[PDB]
């Protein structure tokens, strides 16, 4: 299977079928998003708009998930029942959260087949995030009154952010229901997001898993780890760009400030996760709306128990949103420990050396002695290489599930990431 023999058929037999399949599977979702956007411009009553997006969400859920969408429908009905029963309370967040938790647990306890649950994990995660965020917004006082049935439904079934789309606050969805003019900035954002989504899709499917033997003349257990990591990262970037494309096509995802309308919904940042500065930056820039949801709700609610327990329960809730499945809770707990130890070691070195080696670039007001130079840049490059190593190790699980499979993968990778994290923690203990 010579390199030239691979490339002679690469273009056609990989770039055309995968792009064509992406288009054939997302064209109807894009059409329905555009139809809802155009229909929310005629100036119908608000409840008509919410009913329209409810019907659009029903049709989209049916198209993607053939008939197993009854689980998402029952999750929405149950979330509304729990929000209505506790509409006058101040605990709405914890009530909706316990309801969501019990639902996901009873689901994973063989309420539905493993394949269909793996298929609908994303839709149910978005519905759960939306319901819990609305509960906590009503609790804290950032949303005035509880929504009517049709408003709550049209929020959960927003045709833009139902299948792929990110979590958007209830007020973002309300502003979307208001609608904004179909300017040239809007179409520019939608077209650019679709182009980047298709580019990242074809990269993840064609160039990712086949770059180290062919695209680079270099070549192994770590080269394949980096290949799989990059393939999964670019698949997720495709999903993110497509999600923001649909959320901007439906109308949502804008920030109107000072009567200046910028369609600036960003879901992922590929240049911050591929060329990282620190694992905290990777976790932040991987999924930006999901990071905002997690940080804000879970972390601000549980910070009272100390920062370490707060981030631990943050990652626990992150693994629970997905539904308890191995290779997705082990990875997330390893991420918790890695980011914690890395940020702590960065703070300790930036204290003992007063240098600019923090986990995030220092603001201009910091009294650090080494703002620039060679030591700071070399140490930042070292920590970036460690972050790339951790990312490749963790993403090796996505070679192109079973606990035995994960232990096998990490054992054939010799557990080097956990050893490195433990060594960094011991080093922090010895320094401080």
């Amino acid at each position: 299977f010579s390199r030239q023999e691979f490339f002679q058929q690469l273009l056609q037999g990989c770039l055309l079928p995968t792009a064509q399949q992406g288009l054939d599977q997302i064209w109807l979702l894009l059409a329905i998003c555009l139809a809802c956007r155009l229909l929310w411009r005629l100036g119908l009553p608000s409840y008509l708009k919410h009913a329209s997006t409810v019907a659009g969400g029903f049709f989209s859920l049916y198209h993607f998930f053939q008939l197993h969408m009854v689980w998402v429908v029952l999750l929405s009905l149950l979330c509304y029942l729990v929000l209505f029963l506790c509409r006058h309370s101040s605990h709405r967040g914890v009530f909706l959260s316990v309801t969501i938790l019990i639902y996901l647990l009873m689901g994973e306890m063989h309420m539905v087949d493993t394949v269909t649950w793996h298929k609908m994990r994303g839709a149910q995660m978005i519905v759960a995030m939306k319901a819990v965020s609305l509960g906590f917004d009503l609790d804290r006082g950032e949303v005035g009154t509880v929504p009517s049935p049709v408003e709550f439904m049209g929020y959960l079934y927003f045709v833009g952010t139902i299948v792929f789309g990110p979590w958007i606050s209830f007020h973002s969805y309300l502003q979307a229901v208001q609608g904004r003019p179909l300017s040239c900035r809007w179409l520019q954002k939608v077209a650019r997001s679709l182009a980047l989504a298709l580019l990242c899709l074809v990269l993840s499917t064609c160039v990712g898993p086949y770059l180290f033997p062919y695209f680079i003349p270099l070549n192994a257990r770590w080269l394949r780890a980096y290949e799989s990591a990059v393939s999964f990262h670019f698949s997720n970037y495709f999903v993110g760009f497509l999600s923001e494309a649909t959320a901007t096509l439906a109308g949502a995802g804008f920030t109107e400030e000072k009567d200046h309308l910028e369609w600036d919904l960003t879901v992922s940042k590929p240049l911050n996760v591929e060329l990282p500065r620190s694992m905290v930056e990777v976790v932040t820039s991987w999924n930006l709306p999901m990071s905002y949801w997690l940080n804000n709700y879970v972390f601000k609610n549980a910070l009272r128990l100390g920062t370490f327990s707060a981030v631990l329960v943050t990652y626990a809730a992150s693994a629970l949103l997905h539904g308890f499945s191995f290779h997705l809770a082990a990875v997330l707990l390893s991420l918790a420990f890695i980011t914690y130890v890395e940020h702590v070691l960065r703070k300790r070195l930036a204290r003992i050396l007063s240098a600019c080696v923090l986990s995030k670039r220092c603001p201009p007001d910091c009294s650090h002695q080494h703002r620039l130079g060679l030591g700071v840049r070399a140490l930042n490059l070292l920590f970036g290489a460690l972050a790339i190593f951790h990312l490749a190790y963790l993403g090796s699980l996505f070679d192109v599930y079973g606990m035995a499979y994960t232990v096998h993968k990490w054992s054939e990778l010799s557990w080097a990431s956990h050893w490195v994290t433990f060594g960094c923690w011991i080093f922090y203990r010895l320094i401080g």
Binding site: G13, C14, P17, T18, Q21, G22, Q25, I26, F64, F65, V115, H118, K119, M120, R121, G122, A123, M125, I126, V163, F164, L201, S204, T205, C206, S231, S235, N236, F238, V239, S243, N287, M290, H322, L328, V400
Partner: peptide, 20 residues
């Protein structure tokens, strides 16, 4: 041969692109 990769939200098969 044939291999199917499925793309989705944080690991799911909402959309899959198989190829030869």
């Amino acid at each position: 041969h044939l291999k199917c990769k499925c793309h989705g939200l944080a690991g799911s098969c909402e959309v899959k692109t198989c190829w030869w």
